[PDB]
Amino acid sequence: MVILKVAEWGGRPAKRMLDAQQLPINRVVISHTAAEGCESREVCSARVNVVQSFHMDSWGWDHIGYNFLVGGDGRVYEGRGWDYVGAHTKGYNRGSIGISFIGTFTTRKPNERQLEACQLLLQEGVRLKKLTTNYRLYGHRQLSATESPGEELYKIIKKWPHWSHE
């Protein structure tokens, strides 16, 4: 598994110090970016930079909103990481990890590498004690009024063992 740090994908640091999470975290929220996907380090880095600008400049947040993003190249792009509170799911940022699949998965499935990367990321979080052993996983749409993470991606994660409707 490759996790590219903010600096490694050419991103900016936070505008100010972010709030720290109480670890271990037992909620994960899966979203998509609802923009174009990507199949290489160059293209995915480009996509994540635009996302960071949207969150920091257009919305005026203090950093890219996700804890992690997963590219169609199979690489993980670090956002806020495991230890800080995100800006991805209103009311649920504290005590959760927000992971966004880069792309739009309303009628198209995420690819083999993207799904593999996310599975490895979650297993790494449990292994490092960032996530509880019995963490609950949700689609963004269960917690917020949205299409996110896209019907085809949501149908996939609904069959994952950690998925919860509570």
Ligand X SMILES: CC(=O)N[C@H]1[C@H](O[C@H]2[C@H](O[C@H](C)C(=O)N[C@@H](C)C(=O)N[C@H](CCC(=O)N[C@@H](CCC[C@@H](N)C(=O)O)C(=O)N[C@H](C)C(=O)O)C(=O)O)[C@@H](NC(C)=O)[C@@H]3OC[C@H]2O3)O[C@H](CO)[C@@H](O)[C@@H]1O
Determine which residue in the list 18, 54, 124, 163 makes contact with other proteins, applying CB under 8 A.
Answer: 54
If one asks whether residue 96 binds ligand X (CB under 6 A), the answer comes out as no
Of residues 152, 74, 160, 146, the one with CA closest to residue 115: 74
Which of these ranges, 9-17, 30-38, 114-122, 126-134, lies near other proteins under the rule CB under 8 A? 30-38
Rounded Cα distance between 96 and 91, Å, is: 10
Rounded Cα distance between 95 and 145, Å, is: 20
- CA-CA distances (angstroms) from residue 164 to 4, 7, 45, 86? 29, 34, 31, 21
Residue 134 structure tokens: 């019995």
Rounded Cα distance between 101 and 128, Å, is: 22
96 binds, among other proteins, ligand X, none (CB under 5 to 8 A by kind): none
If one asks whether residue 27 binds ligand X (CB under 6 A), the answer comes out as no
If one asks whether residue 144 binds other proteins (CB under 8 A), the answer comes out as no
If one asks whether residue 57 binds other proteins (CB under 8 A), the answer comes out as yes
If one asks whether residue 34 binds other proteins (CB under 8 A), the answer comes out as yes
Given the rule CB under 8 A, which residues bind other proteins? 33-36, 46-47, 50-51, 53-54, 57-59, 104, 106-107, 147
